[PDB]
Enzyme design. Structure first.
Site, short mmCIF file in Angstrom:
data_model
loop_
_atom_site.label_atom_id
_atom_site.label_comp_id
_atom_site.label_asym_id
_atom_site.label_seq_id
_atom_site.Cartn_x
_atom_site.Cartn_y
_atom_site.Cartn_z
N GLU A 120 0.85 -1.17 0.00
CA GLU A 120 0.00 0.00 0.00
C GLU A 120 0.89 1.23 0.00
OE1 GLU A 120 -2.51 0.29 3.33
OE2 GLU A 120 -3.81 1.82 2.45
N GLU A 204 -9.64 9.45 5.06
CA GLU A 204 -9.89 8.48 6.12
C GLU A 204 -10.51 9.22 7.29
OE1 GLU A 204 -5.81 6.50 6.40
OE2 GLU A 204 -7.17 4.79 6.20
O1 LIG Z 1 -16.33 -4.87 -0.86
C1 LIG Z 1 -16.84 -3.64 -0.37
C2 LIG Z 1 -15.94 -2.51 -0.86
O2 LIG Z 1 -14.58 -2.75 -0.44
C3 LIG Z 1 -13.87 -1.52 -0.33
O3 LIG Z 1 -12.51 -1.77 0.06
C4 LIG Z 1 -12.52 -1.99 1.47
C5 LIG Z 1 -11.14 -1.65 1.99
O4 LIG Z 1 -10.97 -0.26 1.82
C6 LIG Z 1 -9.66 0.15 1.98
O5 LIG Z 1 -9.73 1.55 2.00
C7 LIG Z 1 -9.00 -0.28 3.33
O6 LIG Z 1 -9.13 0.72 4.34
C8 LIG Z 1 -9.53 -1.63 3.90
O7 LIG Z 1 -9.37 -1.70 5.36
C9 LIG Z 1 -10.97 -1.97 3.47
O8 LIG Z 1 -11.22 -3.35 3.65
C10 LIG Z 1 -13.94 -0.65 -1.68
O9 LIG Z 1 -12.66 -0.37 -2.29
C11 LIG Z 1 -14.90 -1.20 -2.80
O10 LIG Z 1 -14.19 -1.55 -4.00
C12 LIG Z 1 -15.91 -2.33 -2.38
O11 LIG Z 1 -17.21 -1.98 -2.85
#
Ligand SMILES: OC[C@H]1O[C@@H](OC[C@H]2O[C@@H](O)[C@@H](O)[C@@H](O)[C@@H]2O)[C@@H](O)[C@@H](O)[C@@H]1O
Length: 223
Positions: A120, A204
């Site tokens: 990341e 965030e």
């Molecule tokens: O599947 C539901 C949505 O997932 C989202 O991603 C979740 C993810 O986000 C990041 O920012 C991170 O903070 C993780 O802790 C968390 O699990 C999102 O991108 C969508 O693509 C989906 O609809």
């Protein structure tokens, strides 16, 4: 706004951009809510804002609502010539616990789920309240003509590099390849084995509000 997204993982797509009302950590909150609003979109970028209030769970992110740039899967980081991006943004209040950050995932598996990656890369344009990045700071680094405090840590098995601006950067035109190149040659980042998974800009949210982040402009150009 032209479209309103209030439900968790509410989604809009257009012009090679997307917005996700990505309230992934909302169960950590004792109370609150958040929507994302599309103000406009074209091929040259989009305009959007988000309003939120979150209380409880002081150290847990409730959400990372974002505007993402769309692109084909399977792009190796070392094959990418340019990851240029422009953003202009502002919060309507100082007193939130939250950041403003680009979030980029890469993975050796080009089909990796978009919710994480092998690695990341975060670029924190601003930091409100006492919120802290993953890991521990390793010093100040010069990347893309600016200085950044580099934090490094692990979120599970994902290694997280966060570049923190020393003061809020409300408007920024960056070359994200600079950050990958820095990591490839200073932090052993295996860029030649990694594929771009997501490229996002958002906020965030930890606690506070009602607060609104306005994105006057967001664009990215990958080639
Ligand atoms: O599947 C539901 C949505 O997932 C989202 O991603 C979740 C993810 O986000 C990041 O920012 C991170 O903070 C993780 O802790 C968390 O699990 C999102 O991108 C969508 O693509 C989906 O609809």
């Amino acid at each position: 706004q032209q479209v309103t997204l209030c439900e968790q993982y509410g989604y809009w797509s257009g012009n090679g951009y997307e917005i996700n009302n990505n309230l992934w950590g909302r169960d950590s909150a004792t109370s609150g809510w958040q929507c994302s609003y599309l103000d406009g979109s074209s091929d040259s970028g989009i305009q959007w804002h988000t309003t939120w209030e979150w209380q409880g769970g002081q150290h847990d992110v409730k959400s990372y609502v974002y505007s993402g740039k769309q692109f084909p899967r399977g792009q190796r980081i070392t094959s990418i010539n340019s990851m240029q991006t422009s953003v202009s943004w502002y919060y309507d209040t100082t007193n939130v616990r939250a950041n403003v950050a680009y979030d980029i995932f890469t993975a050796a598996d080009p089909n990796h789920v978009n919710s994480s990656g092998d690695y990341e890369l975060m670029i924190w344009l601003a930091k409100y309240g006492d919120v802290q990045p993953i890991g521990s700071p390793v010093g100040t680094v010069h990347v893309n003509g600016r200085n950044w405090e580099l934090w490094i840590g692990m979120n599970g098995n994902m290694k997280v590099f966060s570049f923190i601006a020393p003061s809020p950067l409300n408007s920024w035109s960056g070359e994200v390849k600079e950050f990958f190149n820095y990591l490839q040659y200073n932090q052993g980042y295996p860029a030649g084995d990694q594929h771009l998974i997501v490229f996002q800009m958002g906020t965030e949210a930890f606690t506070g509000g009602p607060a609104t982040m306005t994105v006057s402009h967001f664009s990215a150009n990958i080639y």
